[model samples]
Target: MNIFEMLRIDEGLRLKIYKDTEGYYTIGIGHLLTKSPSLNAAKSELDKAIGRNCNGVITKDEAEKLFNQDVDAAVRGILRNAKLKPVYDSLDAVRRCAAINMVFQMGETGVAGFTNSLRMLQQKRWDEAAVNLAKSRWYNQTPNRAKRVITTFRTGTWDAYKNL
Candidate 1:
């Protein structure tokens, strides 16, 4: 999947500010708040992994790099699952992005449960596959974002949300 689309799926179309699960302030594509004193210890650990000063607010470029790293790891993890490797490799770019995006959000095992959707994808039943995707709990939970991916699968376009 392309980096931009992957970021959109993971972080949404705009910047958001919120508290992460561990109650640290976060912004811009799930970046944890490094400047917060509460997270100082963890920030050092993250700094090493990110290869930068993770003790303060980050720039857009920094956020993008972090997002890319996350998507890269997610894709690598998806590739390791033998059951999904063939299915992931079989689709065209747009469809493949949708699959990988789902795997990015939902773990490989979680996405594996969408049996009917995966089946339709393998059969190249674009409309049915889109419908199957919309039928899931994931769709119910994040309707607009899910619809964008569904539209991608339906029309083979990267910016399916624009059509809406």
Candidate 2:
């Protein structure tokens, strides 16, 4: 269902190094340093993702590769949770992509915390799922991303963002 395209469209690409809004080191389409298991592991990920020793620099090709890998990791992370796995599989492609997008921005634990949303989505109550998604601080801070995903959850549309 082209989740890669959906995520690439959602999380903007960056070739240069920068800190996240919270001042944590994040690079290559917004994968964070501390967000990984540890700083060392995250730097290892940065190195492996770019296929080189990185120092605040990466190429467009490297960024592209990293994006795909990150999305794959996101999928794995989302499905690793025993309860969330069935919910994710039960969703249609649009909702599946939206949930992955949420996990990429937030983490799997963040997405899994939405117990009601997961239950409603698994039950195919799209509108209730969207409503549950909107009832969060995530929706407050990231209204645009949240709204786009919320609408998709509601209408089952494939549309996403043009820019963050």
Candidate 3:
């Protein structure tokens, strides 16, 4: 599937540097700031993903390619990680996409922190899982996107983009 399309809708596009939801300098389709030592320690890793210095400008094509690469890695990480694999495989396509979207927003480590939500999903308790996701800080931080994802999780449809 073309994952990048969903990501573009979720992340939007920015040709200039801007601060992200958590106040980190970001650029080019939700690429987080990583050059500073005080920022993400995986700066070099992130740089490699983007294929350029984060401080510089990037074309939309570049951003799309980078985001695709990052999402691929994130999905791979989710699949490889023992804790999330079974849950990931058990979910339907739309639900799996929602989980991958969360992984894209916050790393695998961050997604792993949603213990109650994950458990509910694994149990196939859609309503409870939706509520659990709504109660999260991630929801508060990105309410609109979270609501869309929650709806997708509960209904097994891509309601977020209207036509998905």
Best by the lDDT measure: 3
TM-score of 2: 0.83
Per-model CA lDDT versus the true structure: 0.68, 0.76, 0.78
Q: Choose 1 or 3, whichever is better by TM-score.
A: 3
Off by over 4 Å in 1: 1-6, 9-17, 20-27, 31-56, 162-164
Instruction: Supply candidate 3's per-residue lDDT for 71.
Output: 88
Error of 1 at 62 (Å): 2.0
Q: Best to worst by lDDT, what's the order?
A: 3, 2, 1
lDDT of 2 by residue, 67-108 (tens): 777888889987787877898898887778888888888887
Candidate 3 clashing pairs? none
Candidate 3 global lDDT: 0.78
Off by over 4 Å in 3: 35-55
- Candidate 2 clashes between residue pairs 3 or more apart in a chain or in different chains: none
* Model 2 regions lying over 4 Å from their true place: 35-45, 48-51, 160-164
Question: How many steric clashes does model 1 contain?
Answer: 0
**What's model 1's lDDT at 79?**
83
Clashes of 3: 0
